[PDB]
Design a protein around this ligand. Structure first.
Ligand SMILES: CCc1cc(Cl)c(OC)c(C(=O)NC[C@@H]2CCCN2CC)c1O
Ligand SMILES: OC[C@H]1O[C@H](O[C@H]2[C@H](O)[C@@H](O)[C@H](O)O[C@@H]2CO)[C@H](O)[C@@H](O)[C@@H]1O
Length: 432
């Protein structure tokens, strides 16, 4: 393992040096996921420039350390800190996907805004957790039986780190990804009910809506009066018990299922909206209900141009038509999802986007790469220092460590493999 390590050294500063270059420059690649990928790329850049040079020195000698014990402590803590930073970032990303999968319509909205003061706080956390875990070595816990041997030999620390460095964040991510699978495997279609839940949202206490009117449950307007009494009075009336401002989920649901009925009926009694709704399909019908839910039977009746266009089955035209509206400027995201539903006649507007599936797939493999690279070590290093049946030759140990450092240079090879836009930006910086 003589020049091999030096090859790896450059491979790591090369790939992850690019990964950073791509994100910082490429507008498209500047997303919350990627920003965490940067910090993970930084964990590998530091490893290659502050830890592996010393790993290459201890390799040239037969495991003899001629430098200050203070210089050994720094070296060993950094090695722990980066590896701690890696696995934990990796977990931060896992949760990031979990939210993009479980709550996909909200994820897109909450990544398109001042969503850096979160990312900041996640990266920060991960590094500060990284440091605290490693710092004991710095303040004396790097004890060995000979000063020329520079290694983590402490029986207590090794157990601690193994849990906090690996078996905990690994256990988190594995159980997160367990749930990612469960959800994506459970491809339940959507309907009018799940649609409006997303768009309207569900609340149990009374609240003032966008117009300033008292509301509760899934967009149910209680009263246009400025009285919180009248609101509760109408709320009781609609449920059949003295609520006092609060309801249950299931109450909220039944109240909603009525409003949807009233919405259907309201349209069939309308002399403008009925012929449209008859010539629409189960799904596209659902988007008309949705507009009338948002805007009432007569407001929706005022898109004369678009209502005809939907009857004449001109879908694409109607969509470009409805964008030009005051409805769109007011609530532009909800419009985009209703208009897409009309255009396509599908619920891909409320699904998990392709872009995100492909990310969630990618970072499953980056995680896979890790556990394959680092699990060998954490089993060997634990069993070498807590020993009874030490079938643990130093030849093996050098491999398990070698394998662990190989991991760093792999990430950018995975990012080019599966992500097209990285692959695009990488050849863009290399082509100059
Ligand atoms: C089990 C807890 C544990 C956790 C972490 Cl993050 C560690 O650093 C990777 C170690 C560890 O042995 N480091 C020092 C060794 C010797 C120099 C290189 N390096 C191996 C990568 C370690 O024993
Ligand atoms: O506009 C018809 C609907 O009015 C209420 O719900 C609205 C209301 O306009 C307001 O709270 C807000 O803009 O959203 C919700 C629906 O989007 C009624 O409670 C509904 O039954 C009507 O469909």
């Amino acid at each position: 393992y003589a020049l091999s390590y030096c090859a790896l050294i450059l491979a790591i500063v090369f790939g992850n040096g690019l990964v950073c270059m791509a994100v910082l420059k490429e507008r498209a690649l500047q997303t919350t996921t990627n920003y965490l990928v940067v910090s993970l790329a930084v964990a590998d850049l530091l490893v290659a420039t502050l830890v592996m040079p010393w790993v290459v020195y201890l390799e040239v000698t037969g495991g003899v350390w001629n430098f200050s014990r203070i210089c050994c402590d720094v070296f060993v803590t950094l090695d722990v800190m980066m590896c701690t930073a890696s696995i934990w970032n990796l977990c931060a990303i896992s949760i990031d996907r979990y939210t993009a999968v479980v709550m996909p319509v909200h994820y897109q909205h909450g990544t398109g805004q001042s969503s850096c003061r979160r990312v900041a706080l996640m990266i920060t956390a991960v590094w500060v957790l990284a440091f605290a875990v490693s710092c004991p070595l710095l303040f004396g816990f790097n004890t060995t039986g000979d000063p020329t041997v520079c290694s983590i030999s402490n029986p207590d620390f090794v157990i601690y780190s193994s849990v906090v460095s690996f078996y905990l964040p690994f256990g988190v991510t594995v159980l997160v990804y367990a749930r990612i699978y469960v959800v994506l495997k459970q491809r339940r279609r959507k309907n009018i009910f799940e649609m409006l839940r997303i768009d309207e949202g569900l609340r149990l206490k009374i609240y003032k809506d966008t117009e300033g009117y008292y509301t509760i449950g899934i967009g149910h307007l209680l009263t246009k009066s400025p009285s919180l009494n009248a609101a509760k009075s109408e709320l009781d009336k609609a449920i059949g018990r003295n609520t006092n401002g609060v309801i249950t989920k299931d109450e909220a649901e039944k109240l909603f299922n009525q409003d949807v009925d009233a919405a259907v009926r309201g349209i069939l009694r309308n002399a403008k909206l009925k012929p449209v709704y008859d010539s629409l399909d189960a799904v596209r019908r659902a988007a008309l209900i949705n507009m009338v839910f948002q805007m009432g039977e007569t407001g929706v009746a005022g898109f004369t141009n678009s209502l005809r266009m939907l009857q004449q089955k001109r879908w694409d035209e109607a969509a470009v038509n409805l964008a030009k509206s005051r409805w769109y400027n007011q609530t532009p995201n909800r419009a985009k999802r209703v208009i897409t539903t009309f255009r396509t006649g599908t619920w891909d507007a409320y699904g998990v986007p392709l872009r995100e599936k492909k990310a969630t797939q990618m970072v499953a493999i980056v995680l896979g790469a890790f556990i394959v690279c680092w699990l060998p070590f954490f089993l060997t290093h634990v069993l070498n220092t807590h020993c009874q049946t030490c079938h643990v030759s130093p030849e093996l140990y050098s491999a398990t460590t070698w394998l662990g450092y190989v991991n760093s240079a792999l990430n950018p090879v995975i990012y080019t493999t599966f992500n097209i836009e990285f692959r695009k930006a990488f050849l863009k910086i290399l082509s100059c």
